[PDB]
Structure 1
Amino acid sequence: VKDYKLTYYTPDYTPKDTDLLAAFRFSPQPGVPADEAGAAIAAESSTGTWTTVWTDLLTDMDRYKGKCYHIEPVQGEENSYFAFIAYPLDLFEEGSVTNILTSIVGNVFGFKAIRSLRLEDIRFPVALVKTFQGPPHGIQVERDLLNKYGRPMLGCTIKPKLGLSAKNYGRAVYECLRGGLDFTKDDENINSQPFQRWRDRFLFVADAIHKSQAETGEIKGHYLNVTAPTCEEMMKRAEFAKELGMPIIMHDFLTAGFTANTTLAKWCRDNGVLLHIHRAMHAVIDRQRNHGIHFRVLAKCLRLSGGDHLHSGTVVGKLEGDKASTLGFVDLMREDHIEADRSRGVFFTQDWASMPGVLPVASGGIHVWHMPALVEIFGDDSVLQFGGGTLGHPWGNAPGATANRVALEACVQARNEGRDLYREGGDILREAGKWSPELAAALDLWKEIKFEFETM
């Protein structure tokens, strides 16, 4: 307001357990302090005034007001600060993610006196967590439906092929599922396009699933992509996929939006299919380290809106400056109580009130020599997608699936007995690749990686 401390920057204020906290990282223009920039971010996310000329006639103010209760500098960087501000609970609709987004990040990111702004974390109170539905099924139910205990699950996207007929698509899916994989994923660009409409694809994929599951003895699946132009078309695809008896479907939660994702999650909860979420068009929002919305915020919003699997990206090829952040966020979507720890990026203590967890999917150019690492980083509550590490085996589709299956079971069997998986990954794989030609061929072309000196 004036030299009077702005009535929005109140450092002596401690927040109640029914307040939504938010942590921005901001960098201001030359010649502007930090406290005023914090109070201005606080005033932009709510009533856009510092004074009381509009918002005071009889009583209706000082309640719907976002106080800013902490500001500190970032270590290492200069002219860059953290601002913690806290919103009441009465500003937000009950059960809507759209409203929370458009109320926090509505029009503050265009503030002129700020050079750049990033939203690093967020804390939902329990009173607000309990008005959303959450994931349709979760982790334990999703593990019980398919009857897969102990090991992580395997999958194989069919990415580089495009312009295949519907029947050859069904054929490749059959060869992959019969060989020993569990899931199989559609390319995410594949919708009903003139060379391959959707109903034909659904038909032949369902036939392949039934054949392979009948002649193998366990439960197989295929993530059918139900992303559509309208609510009607999308619900129609989903109903037809349920009719054929499919266990799981797929969606894109950033190009289609949050209204469509919430609608689909409620349908899936009513009708008993599992939902796999695919994060596409995300680097447009959370790549640069100085502007945008970090991805852990969107992971939380997805755990609230709905979804059972979520892509989180591997950590086999990162340093501990980002491996830490990815592990931190992975824990943020499996457990039930996460304590504040800034080394892993968690800013606030979040309690999830017995809401189920989602399941992380690790994908993208991985092969057999990575299996020791993954199996002990993500643990065994995860999914592993093998794009090229399966379809490129020297002699077919089914042998590649068999090779990956053998490697996975070797690594997990070994892990239980106590053997290390950082010292003894290579020799585990080599000792296993002696009574099976498939794993020998797969170990041949793919090269060993030698993570570091001896560990990590």
Structure 2
Amino acid sequence: DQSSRYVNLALKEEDLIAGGEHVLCAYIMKPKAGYGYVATAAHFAAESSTGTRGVDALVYEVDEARELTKIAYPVALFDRNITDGKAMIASFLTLTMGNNQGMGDVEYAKMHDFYVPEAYRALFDGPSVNISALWKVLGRPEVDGGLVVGTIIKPKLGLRPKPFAEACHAFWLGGDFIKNDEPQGNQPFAPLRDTIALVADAMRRAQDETGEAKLFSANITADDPFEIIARGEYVLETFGENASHVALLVDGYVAGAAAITTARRRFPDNFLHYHRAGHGAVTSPQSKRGYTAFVHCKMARLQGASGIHTGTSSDRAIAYMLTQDEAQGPFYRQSWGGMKACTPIISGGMNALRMPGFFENLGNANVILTAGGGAFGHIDGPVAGARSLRQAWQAWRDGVPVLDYAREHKELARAFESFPGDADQIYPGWRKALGV
């Protein structure tokens, strides 16, 4: 209702930016069969702002062909806490992704990128701690501390307390970090209270036997915030001297933003592990509505997640936007004005042999790896498998040729052979160089 009121196509995006009084959002939107693009874009602006410039959201650019709509949102539109003045993602979502996901003259609309000015950005919580908290526990440097080797305990559900704690103890003989699988909590056959006490003990045992610090990411997701807090408090107290070796895992997608903020504000000294479960329905690229993975992860940083699962366009782009002070998104360049980084958590698996190639492309190895147990395949076993990943990181870090590092490191050496086919392709003459 105001394809003149809600549309100002002569505005310079640079102007908007420089101004610092508007949140900008870029969408991939298509108007229903028949309706005008600009009119519909007008309709989406109005509908996402004022019912019926200044407090009005404006369409500043459109690309009919590209199904591209960019809208400026005055920062005065966003809600903030009566308690402390701070911003809230709930509001950001309502305004730029709310009832506008339900219109009638619009076929689909998906947010691809957003820009938040200094004034607004500064009102967000941001990460309290990141991987540097973990580096510290590991006895690593707080700047470029490198790779954290982890896993997920499997089966997903089924293990009793003792069996679960023994599987933890066993991976900790080779690796650094273990996280509960999504669903693990207080099932009647594996009570959280019992399980956690046993996991804490398994942590002590692997620490004494290994001479190395170990880490656990404990699922505290619940519907009730007070339930989240009681889980967190039970976990930290139980872990005792090992309380700083504990990360708090919250599935922020299924429990939502309030679950995330509960852990963030109540346990700001522990890494807040933001797990993404079933955010598939929206972020998935076959989906034309909602927002992208990029957008999701960028939001996570402002929310205060310490790390978030990001996966093995470009995730590299996600990684940069999450960790750098100045990053380029698909549409907007963003400054973070000193907000702490949010650590990428990568999953899947690459043997020790491919690992190096990943770090090269990324440019750092400052990530948490939560690898399928397959990436831990090795003729000598999974302890050796996890060790080889660490050895591959160490070679890469030191700038030492891998073939040479292997000669003095059994598990990396032995790994070459575990995947002789991979070596061939990658390092021809390894055998030569090894004896084998």
TM over 0.5, shorter chain: yes
Which amino acid is the alignment partner of residue 300 of structure 1?
K
The within-5 A match list for 1:300-311 is 300-311=298-309
Q: Matched residues in 2 for 1:8 and 1:151: separation?
A: 48
Match of 1:207 in 2: 201
Match of 1:444 in 2: 417
Match of 1:91 in 2: 77
Superimposed CA distance per residue, residues 223-269 of structure 1 (whole angstroms, 9 cap, x where no aligned partner): 11111242222211100111123322211110011011111101111
Q: Matched residues in 1 for 2:359 and 2:182: separation?
A: 26
Moved more, 232-241 or 431-440: 431-440
Q: Secondary structure at the match of 1:101?
A: helix
1:27–1:115 Cα contact (<8 Å) kept? yes
Superimposed CA distance per residue, residues 75-116 of structure 1 (whole angstroms, 9 cap, x where no aligned partner): xxxxx4211111111111222111111121111122211122
The within-5 A match list for 1:33-432 is 33-49=36-52, 63-74=54-65, 80-94=66-80, 95-149=87-141, 150-160=145-155, 162-179=157-174, 181-243=175-237, 244-245=239-240, 246=243, 247=245, 248-269=247-268, 272-287=269-284, 288=286, 290-314=288-312, 322=313, 325-339=314-328, 345-378=329-362, 379-389=364-374, 392-413=377-398, 416=399, 428=402, 431-432=404-405
Q: Secondary structure at the match of 2:149?
A: strand
Q: Secondary structure at the match of 1:222?
A: strand
Residue 142 of structure 1 and its aligned partner are, at CA, apart by 4.7
Residue 123 of structure 1 and its aligned partner are, at CA, apart by 1.0
Q: Matched residues in 1 for 2:414 and 2:424: separation?
A: 19
Residue 441 of structure 1 and its aligned partner are, at CA, apart by 4.7
CA 1:159–1:364: 2 relative to 1, 3 Å: farther
| TM-score of the pair, normalised by structure 2 | 0.85
Superimposed CA distance per residue, residues 105-156 of structure 1 (whole angstroms, 9 cap, x where no aligned partner): 1111222111221111111111111112211213545533443234322112
1:9–1:67 Cα contact (<8 Å) kept? yes
Which amino acid is the alignment partner of residue 44 of structure 1?
E
Which amino acid is the alignment partner of residue 38 of structure 1?
A
Q: How many residues are matched?
A: 405
Q: Secondary structure at the match of 2:120?
A: helix
Q: Matched residues in 2 for 1:290 and 1:133: separation?
A: 30
CA 1:450–1:311: 2 relative to 1, 3 Å: farther
Residue 405 of structure 1 and its aligned partner are, at CA, apart by 2.7
Q: Matched residues in 2 for 1:144 and 1:157: separation?
A: 22
Q: Matched residues in 2 for 1:166 and 1:390: separation?
A: 26
Q: Matched residues in 2 for 1:391 and 1:138: separation?
A: 25
Moved more, 288-297 or 388-397: 388-397
2:308–2:344 Cα contact (<8 Å) kept? yes
1:250–1:277 Cα contact (<8 Å) kept? yes
Residue 445 of structure 1 and its aligned partner are, at CA, apart by 4.0
Q: Matched residues in 1 for 2:350 and 2:93: separation?
A: 35
2:97–2:290 Cα contact (<8 Å) kept? no
1:338–1:351 Cα contact (<8 Å) kept? yes
Q: Matched residues in 1 for 2:405 and 2:385: separation?
A: 15
Match of 2:83 in 1: none
Identity of aligned residues (%): 31
Match of 1:31 in 2: 34
Residue 412 of structure 1 and its aligned partner are, at CA, apart by 2.9
2:248–2:263 Cα contact (<8 Å) kept? no
2:49–2:57 Cα contact (<8 Å) kept? yes
Superimposed CA distance per residue, residues 176-199 of structure 1 (whole angstroms, 9 cap, x where no aligned partner): 2123x2111111121211221111
Superimposed CA distance per residue, residues 411-450 of structure 1 (whole angstroms, 9 cap, x where no aligned partner): 333xx25x6xxxxxxxx35x54455554455443445188
Higher helix share: 2
CA 1:129–1:142: 2 relative to 1, 3 Å: farther
1:367–1:386 Cα contact (<8 Å) kept? no
RMSD: 2.5
Which ranges in structure 2 are unaligned for 5 or more consecutive residues? 81-86, 429-436
CA 1:395–1:141: 2 relative to 1, 3 Å: closer
1:251–1:278 Cα contact (<8 Å) kept? yes
Which amino acid is the alignment partner of residue 70 of structure 2?
F
Q: Secondary structure at the match of 1:285?
A: helix
Q: Matched residues in 1 for 2:136 and 2:411: separation?
A: 31
